[PDB]
Design a protein around this ligand. Structure first.
Ligand code: OGA
Ligand code: MG
Ligand code: NI
Ligand code: ZN
Length: 331
């Protein structure tokens, strides 16, 4: 068995290996990358996502989200308070302000310490989940707006044509902006490219151990767990590495820098934080290996998780028994 300790693997594809996206994912899996839940891909030196980032300031962040925490430093939830619209240039200036800017630090590990010590005492503002792309249309390799769609994958594997679309999303971050512990919708893959700016630190639980994280979460967030049998689908709970280690939960960590891709694999729980002003692009995708995970994915039906239009068909075809209850949660 390849990668039996479920370490995060880092790949350096050549420009020739960068041509065929599906083939390279399958290669990474042949080497055991998925066992970690997360892999890093450093693009060949010849590649670029676009020519420059000098002209992005007028992108609008219609609904910036202030991430307000509750709990203790290592075990907390966050809610998202909607703020007034602002441009990316306005948001960059805000991120760099004395109130929001990254503190002085020695190295990534020092900054990580500071994050976990102090995150709860601040409420950073995240420009998350913005439909759009920063890849140039002429970028032919690993262009996240040009990937094979999940609907087409389901049709290819299973024979059933379904409605829905699959487009990327932009994320504008600042120091302490946080992504809560989650797997993807329908336990899909995700791919995330850090276009510019400061790093993003990731934590991940191997897919084979995801239920250990779920059991801890039920213990740590006992009200939330009574409310919903899949409350991590709400994407609000944080648990620190220290707490994970105290509770024996297997996990790994890695820091993504600008110019690097990360792939999350089906049922790979992940969480993390941004170091300072940055912009990432991410999208979900599927492969043949996903289908079995999609069929088994948990679902939130309490009403909180509320998701895209295109998840309807995935539930309807892959999980027909659950469909009625899940759709009630959507309406
Ligand atoms: O970058 C973020 O805020 C969150 N990203 C992801 O969870 C991802 O790419 O799967
Ligand atoms: Mg612009
Ligand atoms: Ni994710
Ligand atoms: Zn729920």
């Amino acid at each position: 068995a390849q990668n039996p300790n479920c370490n995060i693997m880092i790949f350096h594809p050549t420009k020739e290996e960068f041509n065929d996206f599906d083939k390279y994912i399958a290669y990474m899996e042949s080497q055991g990358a998925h066992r970690a839940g997360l892999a890093k891909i450093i693009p060949p030196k010849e590649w670029k996502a676009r020519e420059t980032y000098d002209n992005i300031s007028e992108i609008l962040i219609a609904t910036p989200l202030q991430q307000v925490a509750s709990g203790r430093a290592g075990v907390f939830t966050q809610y998202h308070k909607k703020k007034k619209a602002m441009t990316v240039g306005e948001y960059r200036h805000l991120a760099n302000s004395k109130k929001y800017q990254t503190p002085p630090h020695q190295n990534f590990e020092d900054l990580e310490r500071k994050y976990w010590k102090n995150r709860i005492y601040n409420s950073p503002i995240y420009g998350a989940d913005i439909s759009g792309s920063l890849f140039d249309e002429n970028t032919k390799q690993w262009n996240l707006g040009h990937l094979g769609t999940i609907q087409d994958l389901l049709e290819k594997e299973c024979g059933v044509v379904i409605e829905g679309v699959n487009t990327p999303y932009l994320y504008f971050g600042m120091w302490k902006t946080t992504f809560a512990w989650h797997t993807e919708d329908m336990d899909l893959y995700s791919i995330n490219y850090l276009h510019l700016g400061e790093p993003k630190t990731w934590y991940v639980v191997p897919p084979e151990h995801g239920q250990r994280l779920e059991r801890l979460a039920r213990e740590l967030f006992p009200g939330s767990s009574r409310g919903c049998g899949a409350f991590l689908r709400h994407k609000v709970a944080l648990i620190s590495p220290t707490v994970l280690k105290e509770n024996g939960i297997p996990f790994n960590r890695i820091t993504q820098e600008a110019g690097e891709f990360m792939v999350t694999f089906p049922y790979g729980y992940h969480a993390g934080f941004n170091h300072g002003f940055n912009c990432a692009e991410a999208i979900n995708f599927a492969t043949p290996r996903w289908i079995d995970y999609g069929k088994m994915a948990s679902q939130c039906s309490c009403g909180e998780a509320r998701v895209t239009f295109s998840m309807d068909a995935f539930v309807r075809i892959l999980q027909p028994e659950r469909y009625d209850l899940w759709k009630r949660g959507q309406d």
